[PDB]
Design a protein around this ligand. Structure first.
Ligand code: MG
Ligand code: MG
Length: 376
């Protein structure tokens, strides 16, 4: 993640070398900063982004008019930003008959957009704004904003499964973590029509570019794990295989269990898992083999490297074994010196700056969206 300042600075960089992509952005709130952020983020991801911005609140206007500037632009990607905030206003101004059709009408427009067949579409879904008009009782009232929005987000996912060209960017899931209190800045919105806060902007640009990059064929394929204090608490060489911290019951071992469960999901979706550890190989494998509380087993690990050599060399060994790019690899290690040396000595490998407390690893990894993809 970058700051908006860094993203804007990047838009000034020399773009000659980079492959060009034409990106259209159309929204119902003010999009000028988001445009800058997307363009700069793309450049930092090695794309020369030519970004066309529709005029304020002309989404339907541009898409509905075949002679419009939008179609003349012939974009490679079309990013649509329909905000929950503006949909909330739309809903509030109509009677129950039209409110009952809020989701359906929006879904119709989305399908119409998909049917045009114009490059790939990236579409932000809708974080819930609970209006508390009914309280929680809103779930029982079809015409309520809460019901319509829940229906809308569900059917949007079904649209993405029907149209290979249509990608959602999960603004809703992103916002669920940070909260609207952080994502939305009322004072700025009132005076500028900008709906995302300054600190939210780089989060959304990064998540938008993650999708574009994945479609272009740049996505992570492999996760490399340290062992001690990364996937279990403690040091196996000193404490023994029976004594590593993992499993339910109170305390940090539970965090390692839940973290291993995340790794298990990656393996189950085709991510290659490798181990790279400063350990005797026999000792390093023992917990996988003997400790029943391990979630990960040896058969989940494609390449297992445990020795006393520097991890940079070991990662080259792993890369050569797998024949995938260093830039398709993620390396997780609790030791800052190990992280820093892999960063310096194996450029291309992504090395997340894990927080010191293992109880915070997973929520931190969530902020990085490491495993965006574009195929099942
Ligand atoms: Mg370690
Ligand atoms: Mg280790």
């Amino acid at each position: 993640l970058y700051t908006f300042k860094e993203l804007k600075r990047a838009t000034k960089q020399d773009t000659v070398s980079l492959p060009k992509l034409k990106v259209a952005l159309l929204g119902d709130t003010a999009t000028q900063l988001l445009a800058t952020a997307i363009k700069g983020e793309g450049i930092l991801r090695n794309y020369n982004i030519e970004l066309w911005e529709a005029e304020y609140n002309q989404v339907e206007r541009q898409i509905m008019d075949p002679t419009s500037d939008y179609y003349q632009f012939e974009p490679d990607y079309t990013i649509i930003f329909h905000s929950t905030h503006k949909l909330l206003e739309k809903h509030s101004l109509v009677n129950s008959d039209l409110q009952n059709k809020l989701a359906d009408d929006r879904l119709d427009f989305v399908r119409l957009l998909c049917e045009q067949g114009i490059g790939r579409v990236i579409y932000y879904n809708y974080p819930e704004i609970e209006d508390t008009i009914w309280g929680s009782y809103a779930t029982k009232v079809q015409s309520s904003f809460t019901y319509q929005l829940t229906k809308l987000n569900y059917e949007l996912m079904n649209i993405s499964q029907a149209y290979p060209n249509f990608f959602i960017c999960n603004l809703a899931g992103i916002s669920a973590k940070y909260g609207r209190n952080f994502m939305f800045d009322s004072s700025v919105y009132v005076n500028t029509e900008i709906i995302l806060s300054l600190d939210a902007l780089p989060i959304i640009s990064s998540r938008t570019i993650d999708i574009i990059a994945a479609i272009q064929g740049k996505f992570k394929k492999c996760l490399i794990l340290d062992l001690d204090n990364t996937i279990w608490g403690g040091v196996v060489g000193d404490d023994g295989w029976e004594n590593i911290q993992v499993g339910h019951g109170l305390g940090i071992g539970k965090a390692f269990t839940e973290f291993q469960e995340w790794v298990k999901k990656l393996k189950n979706r085709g991510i290659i898992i490798a181990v790279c550890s400063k350990n005797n190989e026999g000792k390093a494998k023992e917990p996988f083999e003997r400790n029943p509380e391990m979630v990960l087993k040896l058969d989940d690990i494609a390449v297992f490297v445990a020795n006393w050599e520097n991890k940079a060399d070991n990662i080259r060994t792993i890369q050569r074994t797998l024949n995938i790019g260093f830039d398709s690899m993620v390396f997780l290690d609790d030791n800052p010196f190990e992280r820093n040396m892999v960063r310096e000595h194996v450029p291309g490998v992504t090395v997340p700056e894990l927080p010191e407390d293992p109880g915070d690893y997973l929520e931190y990894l969530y902020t990085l969206n490491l495993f965006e993809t574009a195929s099942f």
